[PDB]
Amino acid sequence: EVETFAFQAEIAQLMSLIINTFYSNKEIFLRELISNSSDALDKIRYESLTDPSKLDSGKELHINLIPNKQDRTLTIVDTGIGMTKADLINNLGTIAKSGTKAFMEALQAGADISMIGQFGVGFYSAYLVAEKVTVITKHNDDEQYAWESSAGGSFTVRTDTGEPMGRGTKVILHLKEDQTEYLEERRIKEIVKKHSQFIGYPITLFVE
Amino acid sequence: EVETFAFQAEIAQLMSLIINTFYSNKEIFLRELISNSSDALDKIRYESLTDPSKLDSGKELHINLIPNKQDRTLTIVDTGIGMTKADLINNLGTIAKSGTKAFMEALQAGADISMIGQFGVGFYSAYLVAEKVTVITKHNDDEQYAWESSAGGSFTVRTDTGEPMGRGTKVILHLKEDQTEYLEERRIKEIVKKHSQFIGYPITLFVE
Ligand SMILES: CC(C)N(C)S(=O)(=O)c1cc(-c2n[nH]c(=O)n2-c2ccccc2F)c(O)cc1O
Ligand SMILES: CC(C)N(C)S(=O)(=O)c1cc(-c2n[nH]c(=O)n2-c2ccccc2F)c(O)cc1O
């Protein structure tokens, strides 16, 4: 059922860098994930102009933010194009290798972790606030997969023998014990207001 | 040979806004075009991981900046994925309509023309410095096309019965009489240094 993969050397090095560097402006993770959601939503919206049958798996194009104080998780849901088994494993491993090298070269030359997105490696900023990340994704042309990683050099991929979602990506952030502020309504609102105000899709913050 | 199209109402309105608004920080056009080149280069690099035969039309992934004082043109060449007849006409017309609406709504609420890229309509900033724009593009799965526009509500598309380029996009900016500074070596270098320093591809400024 569950397949285990070692991260490429440079990616594993970037994650250790993000987990061990003292950096207080951790809030940047939300903008990076929202921006990735928005790009998946654009990818599906564009593919639907030439082939209107790609919106069969969901007509609605949006982003949902779901805090869960009990489970200590923050979930970012989108109905974007989603990702295939190949994207999760190979594709987002090969494209990452290039940008990871450039970003660490930049940080060496005194750059900021807040610049991570300029290198296409914005996802890894989730390890600033999360101890484990679970990604549930579904692309039209493949099955539903669960990607998971607590860093430490490896990630797992399995078929999601769980509740089905129509086309999209659901990112589950299992927060570190001291990062519970990102489960607070006014805090999420504050971050979204200052970093993701100009997103071309509706962003709905869920209440508890 | 030559097909003439009317721009969608909102796009034609955005171009009039950019051509008529007094705005001195015109230099932003270069970053917007370079960033679009870089995204075309990423699109081809990613499509080449799953299908290595897409790099048959050129192995090299780069951006070339070519000033021509005689012709009063600045050319931005890339070897990115390129664009089809459909992209030039329909696809980049429909996706633009959404972002154009959002950007003008933002500018009404006191936003800056320098924010144009956040709306995916960064291309139209070329009309800050250019009186006419010629786009020569070539995608693997279509022929070579020439797109042209001096704004004024219309653009032209024709098959390029000219010298063939392998996969990519070549943007030719016919500069306004008072925008010749963008043909100067030190000026282009200055703009590239401060706005496009973290591009994941080699940018070569051509000498004259
Ligand atoms: C496991 C993966 C590392 N992520 C959770 S992710 O990349 O941050 C991420 C990816 C997508 C996504 N779906 N389809 C698609 O193309 N993308 C995508 C978008 C932009 C860049 C790279 C990408 F693949 C998303 O909707 C949200 C995300 O948080
Ligand atoms: C006529 C068109 C309006 N442009 C000259 S452009 O969009 O600025 C522009 C487009 C491409 C391009 N080639 N393939 C591709 O997908 N793109 C693309 C990239 C990003 C966004 C939208 C896009 F189509 C490019 O390499 C350079 C550009 O200056």
Author numbering:
A (entry chain A), B (entry chain A): 16 to 223
Q: Can you quote the paper on this entry?
A:
Here we report the investigation of the role of protein flexibility in the modulation of binding kinetics and equilibrium thermodynamics of drug binding to heat shock protein 90 (HSP90). HSP90 is one of the most abundant proteins in the cytoplasm of eukaryotic cells, comprising 2–5% of cytosolic protein under non-stressed conditions. It is a ubiquitous molecular chaperone intimately involved in a variety of pathways, including cell signaling, proliferation and survival, and protein folding. The N-terminal domain of HSP90 (N-HSP90) contains the nucleotide-binding site, which has been the target site for drugs interfering with ATP binding and ATPase activity. The unbound N-HSP90 has a highly flexible lid segment comprising residues 107–14137.
For 7 of the 20 compounds, it was possible to obtain crystal structures of the complexes bound to N-HSP90 with loop-in and helical (8, 14, 16, 18, and 20) conformations of the α3-helix region (loop- and helix-binders, respectively). The main difference between the structures is the conformation of residues 104–111, which can adopt either helical or loop-in conformations. In complexes with compounds whose R1 substituent exceeds one atom (compounds 8, 14, 16, 18, and 20), these residues have the helical conformation with an adjacent hydrophobic pocket lined by the side chains of M98, L107, F138, Y139, V150, and W162. Steric clashes between the ligands and residues 105–107 would prohibit these complexes from existing in a loop-in conformation. All ligands occupy the ADP-binding site and form typical interactions, which include hydrogen bonds of the 2-hydroxyl group of the resorcinol ring with the side chain of D93 and with a water molecule that generally mediates interactions with G97. In contrast, for the helix-binding compounds, there is a large favorable entropic contribution to binding, and most of them have a binding enthalpy penalty. This switch in thermodynamic profile is thus directly related to the conformation of the α-helix3 region with compensating differences in enthalpy and entropy of about 60 kJ mol−1 between loop-in and helix-binders. Protein flexibility is another possible contributor to favorable binding entropy. As previously mentioned, the N-HSP90 crystal structures show higher B-factors for residues 103–111 in the helical conformation, suggesting greater structural flexibility of this region compared to the loop-in conformation. In the helical structures, however, the Q23-N106 interaction is not possible due to the binding site rearrangement, and this may contribute to enhanced flexibility of the helical conformation of the α-helix3 region. on can vary significantly, indicating transition state destabilization playing a role in prolongation of residence time. Helix-binders reach up to 230-fold slower association rates, when compared to loop-binders, indicating a higher transition state energy barrier for helix-binders, as depicted in the right-hand panel of Fig. 6.
